[PDB]
């Protein structure tokens, strides 16, 4: 045995960007890997591990919006990608769909990770509508290839970022909001592995809900005071940024963390919120953690799968 190990792999520009910002934000117990055709971007990566793919193919340039180049680049560097993944129990592959490198290389990276035995989760963006129909169509083909290669896929349409900004919100601030989805998902699973809960969930439960599943929702809700459990549950299952909503979920992993005041009744309330919002009979795998360092705060974390 061993404690399950997580790796986060950014593929292409947006994925590299997300890795850098996640490192800026602070992340423990996760190995970051930056993968790119673009050697200039890779040289600026904050990631401990860097893989320049397609050296012979692009000679250190990007893939110039041709997803076939990203795919061939990943295939040319297959052994390097294998060596960088080796040992991971879980791999998150993050990439912006629509360009040349991520669209083509990220599904190959995901396929390698899954063939190497890792639980493989993709977190990808679709391009803004203002980038045009061709970019959207190219990205859609990437999303489909991603879905065929991963265990579970989280898709963030970049157009959703236009729903959470005002007319002055800096573009980089909007990008950081999108980063929260992956980042807090990683932090949640890390905490799940590391702590023996009063009603415990561990990596085998993660595998049961996420293995070979397709579309997924991951979310988290923190609340306090009067209706804290219902509120936190509602916040966990309702991100404005995700393409896949909770509605239709057949499998759910749900954890509630609270202080010593965490009540049985409010645990039921929270679990019921997820049940009814799913509008399905949900196979729930339910966990609970008492963190006495919490006072009046409750945290609800949800991963939902089983839509397809
Ligand atoms: C700044 C700030 C204030 C507050 C309040 N916070 C902040 C920042 C962050 C960042 C993340 C969080 C909340 C994390 C969370 O609470 O996660 C619970 C985790 O579960 C656990 C955890 C421990 C256990 F002992 C057990 C168990 N019973 O042994 C247990 F179950 C959990 N992770 C997942 C999960 C499932 C799928 C996915 C994927 F994306 F991969 F698809 C990711 C995560 C689930 Br489902 O559950 N905060 B935050 F605390 F809100
Ligand atoms: N949300 C977000 N989307 C991004 C970011 N960077 C790029 N994108 C999106 O990702 C798409 C592909 O860009 P990029 O990753 O640079 O292309 P690649 O390097 O060829 O894979 C773009 O068309 C944008 O829609 C980012 O930092 N955040
Ligand atoms: Ca646990």
UniProtKB/Swiss-Prot annotation:
Keywords, in A-Z order: Cell cycle, Cell division, Cytoplasm, GTP-binding, Nucleotide-binding, Septation
S-S bridge residues: none
GO biological process, one term: protein polymerization
GO molecular function: GTP binding; GTPase activity
GO cellular component: cell division site; cytoplasm
Binding site for GTP: 13-17, 100-102, 131, 135, 179
Protein function: Essential cell division protein that forms a contractile ring structure (Z ring) at the future cell division site. The regulation of the ring assembly controls the timing and the location of cell division. One of the functions of the FtsZ ring is to recruit other cell division proteins to the septum to produce a new cell wall between the dividing cells. Binds GTP and shows GTPase activity.
Family that this chain belongs to: Belongs to the FtsZ family.
The protein's name: Cell division protein FtsZ
Organism the protein comes from: Staphylococcus aureus
Shown stretch of the complete protein: 12 to 316 of 390
């Amino acid at each position: 045995g061993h404690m399950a190990t997580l790796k986060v792999i950014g593929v292409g520009g947006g994925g590299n960007n997300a890795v850098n910002r996640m490192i800026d934000h602070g992340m423990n117990n996760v190995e970051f890997i930056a993968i790119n055709t673009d050697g200039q971007a890779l040289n600026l990566s904050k990631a401990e591990s860097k893989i320049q793919i397609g050296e012979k193919l692009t000679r250190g340039l990007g893939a110039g919006a041709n997803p076939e180049i990203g795919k061939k680049a990943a295939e040319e560097s297959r052994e390097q990608i294998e060596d960088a993944i080796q040992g991971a129990d879980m791999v998150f592959v993050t990439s912006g769909m629509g360009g040349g490198t991520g669209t083509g290389a990220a599904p190959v990276v995901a396929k390698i990770a899954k063939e190497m035995g890792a639980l493989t989760v993709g977190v990808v963006t679709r391009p803004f509508s203002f980038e045009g129909r061709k970019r959207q169509t190219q990205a859609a083909a990437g999303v489909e290839a991603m879905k065929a290669a991963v265990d579970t896929l989280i898709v963030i349409p970049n157009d959703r970022l236009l729903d959470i900004v005002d007319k002055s919100t800096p573009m980089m601030e909007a990008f950081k909001e999108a980063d929260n989805v992956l980042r807090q998902g990683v932090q949640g699973i890390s905490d799940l592995i590391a702590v023996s809960g009063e009603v415990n969930l561990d990596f085998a439960d993660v595998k049961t809900i996420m293995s070979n599943q397709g579309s997924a929702l991951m979310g988290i809700g923190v609340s306090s005071g009067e209706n804290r459990a219902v509120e936190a549950a509602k916040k966990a299952i309702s991100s404005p940024l995700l393409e896949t909503s909770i509605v239709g979920a057949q499998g759910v992993l749900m954890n509630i963390t609270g202080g010593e005041s965490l009540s049985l009744f409010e645990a039921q309330e929270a679990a019921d919120i997820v049940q009814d919002a799913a509008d399905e009979d949900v196979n729930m795998i339910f966990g609970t953690v008492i963190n006495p360092e919490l006072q009046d705060e409750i945290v609800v974390t949800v991963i939902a799968t089983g839509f397809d």
